[PDB]
Amino acid sequence: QSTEDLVNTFLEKFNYEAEELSYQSSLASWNYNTNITDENLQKMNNAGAKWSAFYEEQSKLAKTYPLEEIQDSTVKRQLRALQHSGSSVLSADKNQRLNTILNSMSTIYSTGKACLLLEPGLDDIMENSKDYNERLWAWEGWRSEVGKQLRPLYEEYVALKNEMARANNYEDYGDYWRGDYEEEWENGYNYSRNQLIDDVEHTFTQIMPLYQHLHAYVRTKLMDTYPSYISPTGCLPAHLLGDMWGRFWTNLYPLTVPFGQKPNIDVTNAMVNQSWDARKIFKEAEKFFVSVGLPNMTQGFWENSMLTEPSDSWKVVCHPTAWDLGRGDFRIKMCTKVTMDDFLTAHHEMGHIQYDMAYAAQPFLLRNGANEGFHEAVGEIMSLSAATPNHLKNIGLLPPSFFEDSETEINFLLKQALTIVGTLPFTYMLEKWRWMVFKGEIPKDQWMKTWWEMKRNIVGVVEPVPHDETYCDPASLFHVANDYSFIRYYTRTIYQFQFQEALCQIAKHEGPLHKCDISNSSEAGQKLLEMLKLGKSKPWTYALEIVVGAKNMDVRPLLNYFEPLFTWLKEQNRNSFVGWNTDWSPYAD
Amino acid sequence: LCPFGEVFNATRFASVYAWNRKRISNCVADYSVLYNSASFSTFKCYGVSPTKLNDLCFTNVYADSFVIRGDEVRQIAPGQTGKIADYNYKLPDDFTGCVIAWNSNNLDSKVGGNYNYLYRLFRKSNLKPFERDISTEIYQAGSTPCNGVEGFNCYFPLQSYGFQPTNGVGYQPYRVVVLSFELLHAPATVCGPK
Ligand SMILES: *[C@@H]1O[C@H](CO)[C@@H](O[C@@H]2O[C@H](CO)[C@@H](O)[C@H](O)[C@H]2NC(C)=O)[C@H](O)[C@H]1NC(C)=O
Ligand SMILES: *[C@@H]1O[C@H](CO)[C@@H](O[C@@H]2O[C@H](CO)[C@@H](O)[C@H](O)[C@H]2NC(C)=O)[C@H](O)[C@H]1NC(C)=O
Ligand SMILES: *[C@@H]1O[C@H](CO)[C@@H](O[C@@H]2O[C@H](CO)[C@@H](O)[C@H](O)[C@H]2NC(C)=O)[C@H](O)[C@H]1NC(C)=O
Ligand SMILES: *[C@@H]1O[C@H](CO)[C@@H](O[C@@H]2O[C@H](CO)[C@@H](O)[C@H](O)[C@H]2NC(C)=O)[C@H](O)[C@H]1NC(C)=O
Ligand SMILES: *[C@@H]1O[C@H](CO)[C@@H](O)[C@H](O)[C@H]1NC(C)=O
Numbered sequence A: 001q002s003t004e005d006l007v008n009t010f011l012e013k014f015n016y017e018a019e020e021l022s023y024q025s026s027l028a029s030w031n032y033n034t035n036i037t038d039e040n041l042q043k044m045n046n047a048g049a050k051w052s053a054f055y056e057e058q059s060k061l062a063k064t065y066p067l068e069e070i071q072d073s074t075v076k077r078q079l080r081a082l083q084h085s086g087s088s089v090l091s092a093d094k095n096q097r098l099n100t101i102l103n104s105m106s107t108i109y110s111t112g113k114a115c116l117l118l119e120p121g122l123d124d125i126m127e128n129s130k131d132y133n134e135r136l137w138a139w140e141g142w143r144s145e146v147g148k149q150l151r152p153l154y155e156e157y158v159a160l161k162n163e164m165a166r167a168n169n170y171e172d173y174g175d176y177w178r179g180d181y182e183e184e185w186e187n188g189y190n191y192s193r194n195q196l197i198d199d200v201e202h203t204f205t206q207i208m209p210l211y212q213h214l215h216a217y218v219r220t221k222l223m224d225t226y227p228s229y230i231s232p233t234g235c236l237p238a239h240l241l242g243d244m245w246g247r248f249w250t251n252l253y254p255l256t257v258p259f260g261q262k263p264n265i266d267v268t269n270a271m272v273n274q275s276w277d278a279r280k281i282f283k284e285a286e287k288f289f290v291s292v293g294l295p296n297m298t299q300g301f302w303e304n305s306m307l308t309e310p311s312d313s314w315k316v317v318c319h320p321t322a323w324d325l326g327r328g329d330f331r332i333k334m335c336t337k338v339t340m341d342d343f344l345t346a347h348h349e350m351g352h353i354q355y356d357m358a359y360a361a362q363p364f365l366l367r368n369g370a371n372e373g374f375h376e377a378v379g380e381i382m383s384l385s386a387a388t389p390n391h392l393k394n395i396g397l398l399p400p401s402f403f404e405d406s407e408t409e410i411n412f413l414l415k416q417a418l419t420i421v422g423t424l425p426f427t428y429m430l431e432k433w434r435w436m437v438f439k440g441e442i443p444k445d446q447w448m449k450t451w452w453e454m455k456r457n458i459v460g461v462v463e464p465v466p467h468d469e470t471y472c473d474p475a476s477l478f479h480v481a482n483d484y485s486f487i488r489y490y491t492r493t494i495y496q497f498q499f500q501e502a503l504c505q506i507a508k509h510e511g512p513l514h515k516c517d518i519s520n521s522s523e524a525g526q527k528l529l530e531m532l533k534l535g536k537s538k539p540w541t542y543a544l545e546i547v548v549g550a551k552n553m554d555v556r557p558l559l560n561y562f563e564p565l566f567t568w569l570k571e572q573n574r575n576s577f578v579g580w581n582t583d584w585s586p587y588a589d
Numbered sequence B: 001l002c003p004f005g006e007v008f009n010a011t012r013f014a015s016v017y018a019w020n021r022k023r024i025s026n027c028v029a030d031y032s033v034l035y036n037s038a039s040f041s042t043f044k045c046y047g048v049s050p051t052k053l054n055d056l057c058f059t060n061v062y063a064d065s066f067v068i069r070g071d072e073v074r075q076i077a078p079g080q081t082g083k084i085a086d087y088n089y090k091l092p093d094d095f096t097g098c099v100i101a102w103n104s105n106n107l108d109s110k111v112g113g114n115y116n117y118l119y120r121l122f123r124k125s126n127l128k129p130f131e132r133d134i135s136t137e138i139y140q141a142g143s144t145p146c147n148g149v150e151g152f153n154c155y156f157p158l159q160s161y162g163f164q165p166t167n168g169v170g171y172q173p174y175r176v177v178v179l180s181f182e183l184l185h186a187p188a189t190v191c192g193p194k
């Protein structure tokens, strides 16, 4: 009759009641995503509304039990998970206003027109064009016709969210986002929200030289495509980076290639000349996963999953996803073709599924990853390992007389660096700006000035046209218009290389790290499943320390991964200048 | 001569919290037509051996049938604990009998979800061996009584199995039969082939 038996009974009832509703909602969502008709939306909305109403009603009743009166740990985490409440502590009118603002902002971003709609038209122009004016007009038009119309809504959004955050004993909405990394445990395994900023800042000072060299080879290679628009000592203009914003630099490979005659490893032809279909692809993925000590897929996986387009006049979206419906039901939905990229996404999604099956024994509230960055980093390393020449040579898609040339290795490393290293400053700058805006450090009349000064100082990118305070540049991104946290990718990028170096060390591999394969190593896959079974039942410091042996982030493995590229990049910059001076702007004359 | 057929392929089985008992007497027991069916997932027998079941006879044999989950089958055994082994159906430590189970996904499952099978998850104390409970009185958790209406810390004691064909193996329906052998001062009458 103490304050623990009641909580245990309450948790029992909630655990056995939530499964039904969750399974029904997931089933309805899958059925809609497989057909897309007019009658399935009603069922999906009904299931979602019922589940949300049940969750809110039950979370309302769970705050009557204080936390300090319970001595066990798992029960304490379950109550902590069930006791969170956002936007439920506000007046009804304020909630209605906030919902209207969010819906209007999402809709106004969804159907923007610049003079061609964003998704089909402007993206292709940004990705493929090589004309200065052609990119310039699209960039300026989209920014002017989207950001200028989104300013007052975002001004109201920050105030409403600050009120909501302060109503929940928080200091700021940014402080509310950082709480996903907070821990409370014994002496050696705690973590506070303040240390996240310091941890992120320290990890960024150890990546700057590599970014500077990558910046100085791109600046120098684009001298030719654009003859007299970029200075040899200034910063790169924002409208020449391969995307609308510059989040990824991956579309600059044809312009910046070390050795442009030797091609990369592509095995589409040697795979079509053997009559391979999707079932073969997934069987090979399953063989790879069972060769490292992990189990095999269930029988319902092969019967209920969708692995190809239906050509019988039913419409589908089939963006590659992995589903965990519940009650032992696992499905994968993907429109598979016979290229190599699909062959790698198969491994990625199979890793996603393999993580879900491990923690099915945990209670309902603890069936998720340790934090928001683990679940993607787990799936990334499988794709990293499954694209090496050793694996392809063993499988059969590559002849055994193959020779590993170093120039191809340099090409591969440069492409990977353009994909990975080029996005860290963008994420760091965006998150720092959003935190400072939420915290009230930045005055409301100096948003764009601080934005572009920070861009110049950190990422080395300058605007082509000056902007006053009537614009709003951050809102043009998808994750800013619709409220989503953005610090996941930094942590995922660190974690994946942490895990990869640890497992490669366990596998007794010799040589450079980028040529590592963990196939046919039962110890490597046996150690990894120790953290996969934990789920959210123990702090993520345990999850990190079990595998790698450390309790904090470390960027050393990532730099160890790019060592040959660092050595080669340092030599071709002898007759060049490293760094950028933020006094050059391309409208001074 | 007697129906070990009307216990095994009956149209409708019973819930676990209300388990049905059938007694067989004055008959000849054929235990070879069961062990060679090749459609039974588990055929464990305690206290006897399946080969020697035809030799020594008894007075009465009791058969109990019910429906449980796939991963709760291992709780039907002596000295096992769990949700269903202390609130629904219990077996004594000194057991003499057999436990038989097989998959029933093709029958006890519907797309909309079957809801006619229940089990008990709240009770004040464990069950004595071979004891059955049917009452539906509202369970009391706190010290403040609630008068016949569910509210705060007052819970209904029964819950339903949501069987659907798309579930995994561990969440699919299974049909279980338990046989017990009775030997007392009454004359032994049930045994078979000579
Ligand atoms: C875990 O908690 C301990 C104690 O609450 C933290 O250690 C303190 O850290 C502050 C940092 O400003 C110091 O001023 C104190 O002197 C420390 N106290 C002790 C006893 O060491 C520790 O930092 C927490 N862990 C993390 C990761 O934040
Ligand atoms: C797939 O590539 C193989 C490898 O060369 C091709 O095989 C040759 O095909 C010609 C014409 O059929 C034969 O005369 C040669 O003897 C084959 N060489 C070898 C070593 O196999 C083949 O043509 C391609 N696709 C297929 C199977 O037709
Ligand atoms: C997981 O299931 C697959 C199902 O195919 C198993 O693969 C079979 O393994 C047996 C030997 O155990 C072989 O004789 C079959 O030829 C395999 N099938 C195929 C299609 O190759 C696999 O062994 C199972 N994994 C484990 C650990 O038992
Ligand atoms: C319960 O009914 C099934 C059929 O619904 C019986 O299966 C029969 O098994 C015998 C052998 O034992 C076969 O010769 C028959 O062909 C099967 N089918 C039928 C329709 O008889 C099953 O044996 C029955 N269970 C018992 C008798 O215990
Ligand atoms: C749903 O999709 C299946 C095949 O994926 C199709 O057979 C069925 O007709 C679709 N539903 C409706 C209502 O048409």
Ligand SMILES: [Zn+2]
Residues within 6 Å of the ligand: A348, A352, A376, A379
């Ligand atoms: Zn993924």
